[PDB]
PDB file of all heavy atoms in Angstrom:
ATOM      1  N   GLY A 131       0.280   8.403  -0.082  1.00  0.00           N
ATOM      2  CA  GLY A 131      -0.925   9.219  -0.279  1.00  0.00           C
ATOM      3  C   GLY A 131      -0.800  10.587   0.554  1.00  0.00           C
ATOM      4  O   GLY A 131       0.219  10.929   1.053  1.00  0.00           O
ATOM      5  N   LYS A 132      -2.028  11.217   0.671  1.00  0.00           N
ATOM      6  CA  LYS A 132      -2.097  12.494   1.310  1.00  0.00           C
ATOM      7  C   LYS A 132      -1.820  12.270   2.746  1.00  0.00           C
ATOM      8  O   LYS A 132      -2.156  11.310   3.394  1.00  0.00           O
ATOM      9  CB  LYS A 132      -3.436  13.129   1.007  1.00  0.00           C
ATOM     10  CG  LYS A 132      -3.510  13.586  -0.441  1.00  0.00           C
ATOM     11  CD  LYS A 132      -3.161  15.032  -0.608  1.00  0.00           C
ATOM     12  CE  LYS A 132      -2.800  15.415  -2.086  1.00  0.00           C
ATOM     13  NZ  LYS A 132      -3.763  14.772  -2.928  1.00  0.00           N
ATOM     14  N   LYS A 133      -1.261  13.433   3.353  1.00  0.00           N
ATOM     15  CA  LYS A 133      -0.810  13.473   4.719  1.00  0.00           C
ATOM     16  C   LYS A 133       0.349  12.434   5.022  1.00  0.00           C
ATOM     17  O   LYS A 133       0.536  11.994   6.104  1.00  0.00           O
ATOM     18  CB  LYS A 133      -1.843  13.392   5.819  1.00  0.00           C
ATOM     19  CG  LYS A 133      -3.062  14.319   5.503  1.00  0.00           C
ATOM     20  CD  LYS A 133      -3.996  14.383   6.676  1.00  0.00           C
ATOM     21  CE  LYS A 133      -5.046  15.451   6.465  1.00  0.00           C
ATOM     22  NZ  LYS A 133      -4.415  16.840   6.750  1.00  0.00           N
ATOM     23  N   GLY A 134       1.061  12.016   3.935  1.00  0.00           N
ATOM     24  CA  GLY A 134       2.187  11.180   4.041  1.00  0.00           C
ATOM     25  C   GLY A 134       1.962   9.788   4.410  1.00  0.00           C
ATOM     26  O   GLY A 134       2.815   9.052   4.922  1.00  0.00           O
ATOM     27  N   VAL A 135       0.683   9.329   4.319  1.00  0.00           N
ATOM     28  CA  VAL A 135       0.297   7.947   4.606  1.00  0.00           C
ATOM     29  C   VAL A 135       0.613   7.032   3.405  1.00  0.00           C
ATOM     30  O   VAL A 135       0.132   7.297   2.267  1.00  0.00           O
ATOM     31  CB  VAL A 135      -1.230   7.885   4.934  1.00  0.00           C
ATOM     32  CG1 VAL A 135      -1.590   6.411   5.118  1.00  0.00           C
ATOM     33  CG2 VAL A 135      -1.470   8.657   6.190  1.00  0.00           C
ATOM     34  N   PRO A 136       1.464   6.007   3.616  1.00  0.00           N
ATOM     35  CA  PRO A 136       1.728   5.091   2.495  1.00  0.00           C
ATOM     36  C   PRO A 136       0.526   4.156   2.231  1.00  0.00           C
ATOM     37  O   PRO A 136      -0.275   3.856   3.116  1.00  0.00           O
ATOM     38  CB  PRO A 136       3.005   4.368   2.914  1.00  0.00           C
ATOM     39  CG  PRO A 136       3.081   4.539   4.336  1.00  0.00           C
ATOM     40  CD  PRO A 136       2.397   5.832   4.619  1.00  0.00           C
ATOM     41  N   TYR A 137       0.579   3.603   1.091  1.00  0.00           N
ATOM     42  CA  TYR A 137      -0.466   2.648   0.661  1.00  0.00           C
ATOM     43  C   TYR A 137       0.080   1.627  -0.356  1.00  0.00           C
ATOM     44  O   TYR A 137       1.071   1.926  -1.013  1.00  0.00           O
ATOM     45  CB  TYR A 137      -1.780   3.290   0.181  1.00  0.00           C
ATOM     46  CG  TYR A 137      -1.642   4.102  -1.091  1.00  0.00           C
ATOM     47  CD1 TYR A 137      -1.926   3.585  -2.264  1.00  0.00           C
ATOM     48  CD2 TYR A 137      -1.257   5.400  -0.958  1.00  0.00           C
ATOM     49  CE1 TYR A 137      -1.768   4.375  -3.461  1.00  0.00           C
ATOM     50  CE2 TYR A 137      -1.213   6.259  -2.088  1.00  0.00           C
ATOM     51  CZ  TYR A 137      -1.441   5.671  -3.331  1.00  0.00           C
ATOM     52  OH  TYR A 137      -1.237   6.470  -4.412  1.00  0.00           O
ATOM     53  N   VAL A 138      -0.554   0.463  -0.416  1.00  0.00           N
ATOM     54  CA  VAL A 138      -0.335  -0.429  -1.545  1.00  0.00           C
ATOM     55  C   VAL A 138      -1.565  -0.559  -2.306  1.00  0.00           C
ATOM     56  O   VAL A 138      -2.688  -0.276  -1.812  1.00  0.00           O
ATOM     57  CB  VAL A 138       0.195  -1.814  -1.145  1.00  0.00           C
ATOM     58  CG1 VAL A 138       1.336  -1.693  -0.216  1.00  0.00           C
ATOM     59  CG2 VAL A 138      -0.897  -2.649  -0.426  1.00  0.00           C
ATOM     60  N   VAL A 139      -1.485  -0.949  -3.616  1.00  0.00           N
ATOM     61  CA  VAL A 139      -2.581  -1.313  -4.408  1.00  0.00           C
ATOM     62  C   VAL A 139      -2.408  -2.683  -4.982  1.00  0.00           C
ATOM     63  O   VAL A 139      -1.363  -3.002  -5.579  1.00  0.00           O
ATOM     64  CB  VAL A 139      -2.705  -0.316  -5.615  1.00  0.00           C
ATOM     65  CG1 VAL A 139      -3.964  -0.467  -6.407  1.00  0.00           C
ATOM     66  CG2 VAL A 139      -2.546   1.173  -5.177  1.00  0.00           C
ATOM     67  N   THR A 140      -3.329  -3.594  -4.619  1.00  0.00           N
ATOM     68  CA  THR A 140      -3.199  -4.974  -5.064  1.00  0.00           C
ATOM     69  C   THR A 140      -3.730  -5.078  -6.529  1.00  0.00           C
ATOM     70  O   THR A 140      -4.166  -4.113  -7.140  1.00  0.00           O
ATOM     71  CB  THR A 140      -3.907  -5.918  -4.125  1.00  0.00           C
ATOM     72  OG1 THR A 140      -5.320  -5.851  -4.422  1.00  0.00           O
ATOM     73  CG2 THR A 140      -3.638  -5.507  -2.681  1.00  0.00           C
ATOM     74  N   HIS A 141      -3.692  -6.310  -6.988  1.00  0.00           N
ATOM     75  CA  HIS A 141      -3.944  -6.561  -8.404  1.00  0.00           C
ATOM     76  C   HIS A 141      -5.480  -6.405  -8.772  1.00  0.00           C
ATOM     77  O   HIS A 141      -5.765  -6.130  -9.855  1.00  0.00           O
ATOM     78  CB  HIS A 141      -3.438  -7.861  -8.929  1.00  0.00           C
ATOM     79  CG  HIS A 141      -4.362  -8.991  -8.458  1.00  0.00           C
ATOM     80  ND1 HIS A 141      -4.707  -9.370  -7.212  1.00  0.00           N
ATOM     81  CD2 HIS A 141      -5.148  -9.803  -9.271  1.00  0.00           C
ATOM     82  CE1 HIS A 141      -5.503 -10.411  -7.265  1.00  0.00           C
ATOM     83  NE2 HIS A 141      -5.801 -10.696  -8.412  1.00  0.00           N
ATOM     84  N   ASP A 142      -6.341  -6.548  -7.738  1.00  0.00           N
ATOM     85  CA  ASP A 142      -7.742  -6.233  -7.892  1.00  0.00           C
ATOM     86  C   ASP A 142      -8.113  -4.894  -7.263  1.00  0.00           C
ATOM     87  O   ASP A 142      -9.238  -4.664  -6.887  1.00  0.00           O
ATOM     88  CB  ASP A 142      -8.650  -7.395  -7.252  1.00  0.00           C
ATOM     89  CG  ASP A 142      -8.493  -7.421  -5.755  1.00  0.00           C
ATOM     90  OD1 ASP A 142      -7.368  -7.228  -5.204  1.00  0.00           O
ATOM     91  OD2 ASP A 142      -9.567  -7.682  -5.153  1.00  0.00           O
ATOM     92  N   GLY A 143      -7.120  -4.010  -7.216  1.00  0.00           N
ATOM     93  CA  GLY A 143      -7.498  -2.542  -6.949  1.00  0.00           C
ATOM     94  C   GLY A 143      -7.822  -2.179  -5.507  1.00  0.00           C
ATOM     95  O   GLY A 143      -8.242  -1.100  -5.257  1.00  0.00           O
ATOM     96  N   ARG A 144      -7.578  -3.149  -4.594  1.00  0.00           N
ATOM     97  CA  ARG A 144      -7.744  -2.702  -3.189  1.00  0.00           C
ATOM     98  C   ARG A 144      -6.604  -1.822  -2.742  1.00  0.00           C
ATOM     99  O   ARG A 144      -5.473  -2.161  -2.951  1.00  0.00           O
ATOM    100  CB  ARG A 144      -7.795  -3.974  -2.311  1.00  0.00           C
ATOM    101  CG  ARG A 144      -8.438  -5.167  -2.917  1.00  0.00           C
ATOM    102  CD  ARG A 144      -8.291  -6.380  -1.969  1.00  0.00           C
ATOM    103  NE  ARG A 144      -9.130  -6.268  -0.818  1.00  0.00           N
ATOM    104  CZ  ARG A 144     -10.427  -6.640  -0.759  1.00  0.00           C
ATOM    105  NH1 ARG A 144     -11.028  -7.127  -1.785  1.00  0.00           N
ATOM    106  NH2 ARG A 144     -11.069  -6.406   0.320  1.00  0.00           N
ATOM    107  N   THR A 145      -6.933  -0.798  -2.032  1.00  0.00           N
ATOM    108  CA  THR A 145      -5.961   0.131  -1.425  1.00  0.00           C
ATOM    109  C   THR A 145      -5.911  -0.192   0.080  1.00  0.00           C
ATOM    110  O   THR A 145      -6.961  -0.201   0.780  1.00  0.00           O
ATOM    111  CB  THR A 145      -6.402   1.554  -1.591  1.00  0.00           C
ATOM    112  OG1 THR A 145      -6.252   1.905  -2.986  1.00  0.00           O
ATOM    113  CG2 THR A 145      -5.543   2.508  -0.843  1.00  0.00           C
ATOM    114  N   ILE A 146      -4.712  -0.396   0.611  1.00  0.00           N
ATOM    115  CA  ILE A 146      -4.422  -0.806   1.947  1.00  0.00           C
ATOM    116  C   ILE A 146      -3.461   0.177   2.538  1.00  0.00           C
ATOM    117  O   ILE A 146      -2.343   0.310   2.068  1.00  0.00           O
ATOM    118  CB  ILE A 146      -3.934  -2.229   2.012  1.00  0.00           C
ATOM    119  CG1 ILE A 146      -4.894  -3.239   1.499  1.00  0.00           C
ATOM    120  CG2 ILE A 146      -3.607  -2.554   3.474  1.00  0.00           C
ATOM    121  CD1 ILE A 146      -4.309  -4.589   1.228  1.00  0.00           C
ATOM    122  N   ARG A 147      -3.908   0.887   3.618  1.00  0.00           N
ATOM    123  CA  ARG A 147      -3.133   1.950   4.148  1.00  0.00           C
ATOM    124  C   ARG A 147      -2.227   1.361   5.232  1.00  0.00           C
ATOM    125  O   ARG A 147      -2.549   0.361   5.934  1.00  0.00           O
ATOM    126  CB  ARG A 147      -3.965   3.088   4.688  1.00  0.00           C
ATOM    127  CG  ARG A 147      -4.911   3.677   3.618  1.00  0.00           C
ATOM    128  CD  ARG A 147      -4.960   5.176   3.848  1.00  0.00           C
ATOM    129  NE  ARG A 147      -5.226   5.540   5.185  1.00  0.00           N
ATOM    130  CZ  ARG A 147      -5.344   6.777   5.637  1.00  0.00           C
ATOM    131  NH1 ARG A 147      -5.220   7.752   4.864  1.00  0.00           N
ATOM    132  NH2 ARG A 147      -5.541   7.025   6.882  1.00  0.00           N
ATOM    133  N   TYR A 148      -1.153   2.164   5.533  1.00  0.00           N
ATOM    134  CA  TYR A 148      -0.116   1.783   6.464  1.00  0.00           C
ATOM    135  C   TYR A 148       0.412   0.356   6.235  1.00  0.00           C
ATOM    136  O   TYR A 148       0.271  -0.478   7.141  1.00  0.00           O
ATOM    137  CB  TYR A 148      -0.565   2.000   7.926  1.00  0.00           C
ATOM    138  CG  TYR A 148      -0.890   3.382   8.333  1.00  0.00           C
ATOM    139  CD1 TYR A 148      -2.180   3.778   8.517  1.00  0.00           C
ATOM    140  CD2 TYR A 148       0.104   4.438   8.339  1.00  0.00           C
ATOM    141  CE1 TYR A 148      -2.559   5.104   8.801  1.00  0.00           C
ATOM    142  CE2 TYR A 148      -0.290   5.671   8.663  1.00  0.00           C
ATOM    143  CZ  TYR A 148      -1.557   6.013   8.841  1.00  0.00           C
ATOM    144  OH  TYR A 148      -1.883   7.291   9.209  1.00  0.00           O
ATOM    145  N   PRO A 149       1.071   0.067   5.144  1.00  0.00           N
ATOM    146  CA  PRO A 149       1.531  -1.287   4.934  1.00  0.00           C
ATOM    147  C   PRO A 149       2.908  -1.416   5.565  1.00  0.00           C
ATOM    148  O   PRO A 149       3.505  -0.475   6.113  1.00  0.00           O
ATOM    149  CB  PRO A 149       1.643  -1.368   3.452  1.00  0.00           C
ATOM    150  CG  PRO A 149       1.952  -0.029   2.996  1.00  0.00           C
ATOM    151  CD  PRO A 149       1.478   1.009   3.998  1.00  0.00           C
ATOM    152  N   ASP A 150       3.448  -2.600   5.547  1.00  0.00           N
ATOM    153  CA  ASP A 150       4.834  -2.852   6.009  1.00  0.00           C
ATOM    154  C   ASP A 150       5.823  -2.188   5.074  1.00  0.00           C
ATOM    155  O   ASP A 150       5.627  -2.194   3.848  1.00  0.00           O
ATOM    156  CB  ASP A 150       5.097  -4.380   6.019  1.00  0.00           C
ATOM    157  CG  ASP A 150       6.430  -4.749   6.763  1.00  0.00           C
ATOM    158  OD1 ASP A 150       7.499  -4.501   6.203  1.00  0.00           O
ATOM    159  OD2 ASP A 150       6.276  -5.249   7.889  1.00  0.00           O
ATOM    160  N   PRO A 151       6.902  -1.537   5.585  1.00  0.00           N
ATOM    161  CA  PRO A 151       7.844  -0.875   4.716  1.00  0.00           C
ATOM    162  C   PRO A 151       8.602  -1.768   3.808  1.00  0.00           C
ATOM    163  O   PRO A 151       9.237  -1.310   2.842  1.00  0.00           O
ATOM    164  CB  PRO A 151       8.748  -0.159   5.697  1.00  0.00           C
ATOM    165  CG  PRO A 151       7.936  -0.005   6.925  1.00  0.00           C
ATOM    166  CD  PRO A 151       7.206  -1.254   6.973  1.00  0.00           C
ATOM    167  N   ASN A 152       8.725  -3.123   4.200  1.00  0.00           N
ATOM    168  CA  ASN A 152       9.473  -4.039   3.283  1.00  0.00           C
ATOM    169  C   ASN A 152       8.722  -4.404   1.989  1.00  0.00           C
ATOM    170  O   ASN A 152       9.330  -4.957   1.103  1.00  0.00           O
ATOM    171  CB  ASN A 152       9.757  -5.337   4.105  1.00  0.00           C
ATOM    172  CG  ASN A 152      10.695  -5.075   5.187  1.00  0.00           C
ATOM    173  OD1 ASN A 152      11.119  -3.988   5.454  1.00  0.00           O
ATOM    174  ND2 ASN A 152      10.950  -6.156   5.943  1.00  0.00           N
ATOM    175  N   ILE A 153       7.423  -4.150   1.988  1.00  0.00           N
ATOM    176  CA  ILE A 153       6.580  -4.612   0.803  1.00  0.00           C
ATOM    177  C   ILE A 153       6.915  -3.613  -0.376  1.00  0.00           C
ATOM    178  O   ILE A 153       6.543  -2.450  -0.315  1.00  0.00           O
ATOM    179  CB  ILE A 153       5.126  -4.644   1.140  1.00  0.00           C
ATOM    180  CG1 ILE A 153       4.803  -5.435   2.392  1.00  0.00           C
ATOM    181  CG2 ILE A 153       4.333  -5.059  -0.090  1.00  0.00           C
ATOM    182  CD1 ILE A 153       3.437  -5.357   2.891  1.00  0.00           C
ATOM    183  N   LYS A 154       7.607  -4.139  -1.344  1.00  0.00           N
ATOM    184  CA  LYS A 154       7.810  -3.460  -2.612  1.00  0.00           C
ATOM    185  C   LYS A 154       6.890  -4.138  -3.683  1.00  0.00           C
ATOM    186  O   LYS A 154       6.129  -4.989  -3.285  1.00  0.00           O
ATOM    187  CB  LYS A 154       9.266  -3.440  -3.063  1.00  0.00           C
ATOM    188  CG  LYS A 154      10.202  -3.293  -1.906  1.00  0.00           C
ATOM    189  CD  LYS A 154      10.289  -1.801  -1.598  1.00  0.00           C
ATOM    190  CE  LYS A 154      11.185  -1.593  -0.297  1.00  0.00           C
ATOM    191  NZ  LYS A 154      10.912  -0.270   0.265  1.00  0.00           N
ATOM    192  N   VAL A 155       6.955  -3.639  -4.863  1.00  0.00           N
ATOM    193  CA  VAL A 155       6.078  -4.117  -5.917  1.00  0.00           C
ATOM    194  C   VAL A 155       6.446  -5.614  -6.328  1.00  0.00           C
ATOM    195  O   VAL A 155       7.483  -6.005  -6.032  1.00  0.00           O
ATOM    196  CB  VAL A 155       6.324  -3.105  -7.111  1.00  0.00           C
ATOM    197  CG1 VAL A 155       5.656  -3.488  -8.486  1.00  0.00           C
ATOM    198  CG2 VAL A 155       5.658  -1.773  -6.745  1.00  0.00           C
ATOM    199  N   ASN A 156       5.438  -6.261  -6.961  1.00  0.00           N
ATOM    200  CA  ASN A 156       5.450  -7.606  -7.407  1.00  0.00           C
ATOM    201  C   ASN A 156       5.707  -8.607  -6.210  1.00  0.00           C
ATOM    202  O   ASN A 156       6.271  -9.637  -6.351  1.00  0.00           O
ATOM    203  CB  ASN A 156       6.625  -7.873  -8.428  1.00  0.00           C
ATOM    204  CG  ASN A 156       6.612  -6.915  -9.507  1.00  0.00           C
ATOM    205  OD1 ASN A 156       5.672  -6.661 -10.209  1.00  0.00           O
ATOM    206  ND2 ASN A 156       7.794  -6.272  -9.724  1.00  0.00           N
ATOM    207  N   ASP A 157       5.172  -8.212  -5.031  1.00  0.00           N
ATOM    208  CA  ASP A 157       5.063  -9.168  -3.936  1.00  0.00           C
ATOM    209  C   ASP A 157       3.630  -9.576  -3.777  1.00  0.00           C
ATOM    210  O   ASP A 157       2.700  -8.959  -4.413  1.00  0.00           O
ATOM    211  CB  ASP A 157       5.610  -8.536  -2.667  1.00  0.00           C
ATOM    212  CG  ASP A 157       7.027  -8.017  -2.818  1.00  0.00           C
ATOM    213  OD1 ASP A 157       7.644  -8.260  -3.866  1.00  0.00           O
ATOM    214  OD2 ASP A 157       7.504  -7.339  -1.843  1.00  0.00           O
TER     215      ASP A 157
END
């Protein structure tokens, strides 16, 4: 996202900032 902050989006649309770098998709 903006200012280079990573995020994940879960299957119910929750956005979680600063996740673990090992988390890729379909986990």
Side-chain angles (χ1 to χ4, degrees):
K132 288 263 164 46
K133 312 191 170 282
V135 176
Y137 60 97
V138 307
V139 190
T140 79
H141 83 293
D142 70 323
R144 328 173 70 86
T145 290
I146 298 168
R147 304 217 311 180
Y148 296 109
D150 192 288
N152 295 357
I153 307 172
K154 320 282 174 199
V155 168
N156 313 305
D157 305 354

